[PDB]
């Protein structure tokens, strides 16, 4: 259960949606094929339906250092990133709540185990920024 300042928060479930497929026109790297992959982020409401994650005004994907400019910023839902590469990796996704309410680091793993796969993560969100609280009402109780 919450304690102290963390009592004044609500939980929301985010869904990270990943897709990937081989690009045959790109030469394999050490016999490993290069794949196009994409990540998007949605919010789930109280019933489990996907809705735009408008509670974030920015998402930054912190990619493996083998990527050029590996910190990729997106400002509009669903914060879709598309890249290419030959290996999976853990990556932190920084999501920035509206009204400077806070950064959350969501641990993701980009991998090729399925053509597409979805992972849910629960984040705790404060209730002290009017515009964020009004936005939060779209996805459930506050």
């Amino acid at each position: 259960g919450p304690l102290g300042s963390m009592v004044a928060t609500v939980k929301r479930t985010i869904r990270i949606k990943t897709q990937q497929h081989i690009l045959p026109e790109v030469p394999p790297v050490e016999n490993f094929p290069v794949r196009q992959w994409s990540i998007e982020i949605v919010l789930l409401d109280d019933e489990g339906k996907e809705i735009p994650a408008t509670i974030f005004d920015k998402v930054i994907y912190h990619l493996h250092p083998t990527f050029a400019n590996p910190n990729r910023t997106f400002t509009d839902p669903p914060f879709r990133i598309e890249e290419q590469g030959w290996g999976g990796f853990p990556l932190d996704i920084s999501v920035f709540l509206l009204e400077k309410a806070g950064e959350r680091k969501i641990p993701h793993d980009l991998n090729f185990l399925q053509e597409s796969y979805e992972v849910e993560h629960v984040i705790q969100i404060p209730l002290n920024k009017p515009l964020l609280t009004e936005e939060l009402a779209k996805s459930g109780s506050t």
């Binding site: 083998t66 590469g85 030959w86 290996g87 999976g88 990796f89 991998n111 090729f112």
Partner: peptide, 6 residues
């Protein structure tokens, strides 16, 4: 499908 970076 199990390829991973370093």
């Amino acid at each position: 499908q199990t390829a991973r970076k370093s």
